[PDB]
Amino acid sequence: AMTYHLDVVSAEQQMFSGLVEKIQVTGSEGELGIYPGHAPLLTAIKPGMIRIVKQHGHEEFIYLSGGILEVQPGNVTVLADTAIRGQDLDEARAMEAKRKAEEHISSSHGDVDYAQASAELAKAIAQLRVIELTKK
Amino acid sequence: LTDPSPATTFAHLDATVVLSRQIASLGIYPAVDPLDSTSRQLDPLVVGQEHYDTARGVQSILQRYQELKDIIAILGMDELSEEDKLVVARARKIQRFLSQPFFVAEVFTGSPGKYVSLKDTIRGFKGIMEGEYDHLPEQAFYMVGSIEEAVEKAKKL
Amino acid sequence: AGAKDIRSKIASVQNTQKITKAMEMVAASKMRKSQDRMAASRPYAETMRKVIGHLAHGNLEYKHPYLEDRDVKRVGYLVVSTDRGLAGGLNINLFKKLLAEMKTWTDKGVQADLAMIGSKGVSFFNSVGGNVVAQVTGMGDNPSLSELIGPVKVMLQAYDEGRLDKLYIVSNKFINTMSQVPTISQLLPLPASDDDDLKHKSWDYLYEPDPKALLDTLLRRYVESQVYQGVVENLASEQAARMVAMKAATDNGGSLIKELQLVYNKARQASITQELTEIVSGAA
Amino acid sequence: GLFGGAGVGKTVNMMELIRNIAIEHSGYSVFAGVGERTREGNDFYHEMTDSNVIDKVSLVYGQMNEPPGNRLRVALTGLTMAEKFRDEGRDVLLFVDNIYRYTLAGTEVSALLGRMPSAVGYQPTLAEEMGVLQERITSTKTGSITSVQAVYVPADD
Amino acid sequence: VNPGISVSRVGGAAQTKIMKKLSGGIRTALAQYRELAAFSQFASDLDDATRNQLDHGQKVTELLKQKQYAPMS
Amino acid sequence: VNPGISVSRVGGAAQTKIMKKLSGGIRTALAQYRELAAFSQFASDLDDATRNQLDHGQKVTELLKQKQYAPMS
Question: Is there a contact between C24 and C165 (Cβ–Cβ < 8 Å)?
């Protein structure tokens, strides 16, 4: 069952898109489904698989992490926190950034090519005394 | 330099001086190989420490700018270590700094010049050592007058 | 000398150039992948402004605790810091303009707090010293919102605290393929986008709870996107900029190589010479 | 002057010249190889049959099987020979072989001469020889002598 | 043997229309495996044309390898 | 003078059980400081273990000093 204008999207990734004329999904606070003709409103929903009838009677249960999905007049769209925001949580991160800031800490890129490159630069420049012989 | 003629030079040499066709080529009017030339008589004890010392220091700088000169030429300056970069400033500045006018010199270049006073120089040693004038103009320093004079330039220039 | 020092130099040059090309090519590939990849940022944010504002027509009238943010006390700025090598002048420009702003703040004399992201500007600031709450580093090619989170939440503790009125956020926008302009950002300001609330929101708006949750929360979420993206622009831009440097740096040396060619020329001349003088000499 | 080389099929260029001389003009010239891999030569003779145009021009060839006195000598020959046709008031141009072969032959002569070679062991007068050579070519009032030459390119020094 | 550094003006005039015929790509491609192989050192994650071509190249070279004191047909 | 620029086959027979004893690190520091040079080029590539070495080598470096004219105790 495809609706008119619908998409499941994050800027990072659009989960689904196009119309879905039926969507079974559990609203955070209440029962949720999709069917045309309801009025525009906004909500968020708890995480879980959302079984939605889509075009040509495609239907699938789509795991939600939960997040705010809403429908404008004539339009349907799905937003969700990729992960529900943790309480406390990033508090621990503030701790780690106060420790880290206070007590030095590092995190490294992985390009072997960068490593090899460094070798190339030291090594390359290395053993260069040649400038003396050079004249100008 | 291998010139055995030049050998008997240094060999028999008593006093001597040297000149840099790069420094010349640098368009520097004075154009002597400073890094090169040396005074057997120079003694620090004779010179006190301040002379020996300071001179030593500049020598160090020269060593350094010579030293990285490669690294730049290779890499350009993009990677310049802060401190190094700073020194380099002091460097072009210091080279640029040595130059001053000469009274009789107005012939070649219409510009005159003047006799110089050692103590004033000694001052230069410090302020430069200080890099005392932080805003000091590089172009100003060349073929220039005293820190007071170069300060007058500095006013305009 | 004797191609010992001459050729020795030469091999130096050859290996040099090889390294150079490898540098250039690989660098390029990375950059291209970066441009291609970075494109995806707009979607949810765009939603957030359109949506957000449309609501704001008469609804924004209700309250603006968030829009108030913090009163003029401390100012602030976002900061990112580099995980990539030899990228280019960059934090020259950035750290530079930053210094300028800091000057204005002292001129303002207004209080302020620093927060950095990454190692390099951590080396600016850290090196530069300053007043910085905290920094976050090493997320590398894969930036992660979750990685962003802890940093972001610590950030929230400000408007939360309402401790510091305005806070900047800096990254160098893309001047596209030719370039990336540097960019610095207002922040702990309001977004102040008046287009989307221009018309009274037509869509029936039913809010089970009060929107304030969406204000603090949603607001946070959306603002985050701008972060992620400008981060990205900084990123692909990084890849390209370094890529460009590769060519030129590479090219320079060849001249020197030609000079050296002259050196083995003067030298070829020379061996020819001492050899010759010695050849007469052996004739004796 | 000639730059080009193996794989150029320069003979293609030459044949072009053949159609070019007759086709362009009555004037007809010949060149001669010296100090050279024979196979090329005979193949070029066959190539003359294929060319079929060989009639207009002909030459003895050195092929480097030979003693120098001959070799170095050869030049004066062609000098006189075309000197028939430019002497004929006809006018023409001939190709020319590896000079370094030629001048170098100069040195081998000079060692032979027992004379002190020029520097880098050239023929102490080798320039003089060049005087002979380059000096030779002229477009007379009544004749024209052009030519092209490929000399052994020595390391591109 | 110097891999293509060595050179012969003569060529394959005497070569068997099969042996003659079939022999080309080794010169050129083999050149490109040495030559091309360069990136690998620094480079990484290359596309497949590189992958297969390169494999055929390197391993092919292995095939080239020949035992001392050994005859051929 | 440079470590290893100058060498003597006679070696440490003259060196005294104390003098002989205590004298080892020179070469490595030599090496080290010398070797230290290697990464100096690649600016800022190294951690504190390195820094402790290198520092120690700067330190030894300093430790070398002599007057233009001095007696030795």
Answer: no
Length of chain D, in residues: 157
Cβ(C204)–Cβ(C85) below 8 Å: no
Locate the DSSP E strands across chain A: 5-8, 22-23, 25-26, 31-32, 41-45, 49-54, 58-63, 67-71, 75-78
Measured between CB atoms, which of B22, B25, B74 is closest to A125? B74
Contact present, E54 and E30 (Cβ < 8 Å)? no
Of the CATH numbers 3.30.1660.10, 3.40.1190.20, 3.30.420.40, 1.10.1140.10, which one belongs to the domain with range B42-157? 1.10.1140.10
Spell out which residues of chain C touch residue B74, defining contact as CB-CB under 8 Å. Answer: 253
- My answer on whether C150 and C180 are in the same domain is yes
* Closest by CA position to C201, among listed A40, A5, A44, A75: A40
Nearest-neighbour CA in chain A from F15: distance (Å): 34
Say if B41 is an interface residue toward chain A (CB within 8 Å): no
Write out residues 27-56 of D within 8 Å (CB-CB) of C: none
Of residues A22, A33, A32, the one with CA closest to residue A56: A22
Size of chain F in residues: 73
Resolution attained, angstroms: 6.9
What 3-state class would DSSP assign to B120? helix
Q: Which of D120, D122, D156, D157 to mutate to test the interface with C (most CBs of C within 10 A)?
A: D120
For residue D78, say whether it is annotated as part of any ligand binding site: no
For chain B, the first-to-last Cα distance in angstroms comes to 41
With residue C75 as reference, give the H or E element that holds it: strand C74-77
Which DSSP symbol is given to B149?
H
Q: How far apart are CA B74 and CA C256, in angstroms?
A: 10
Confirm whether residue D111 is marked as ligand binding.
Answer: no
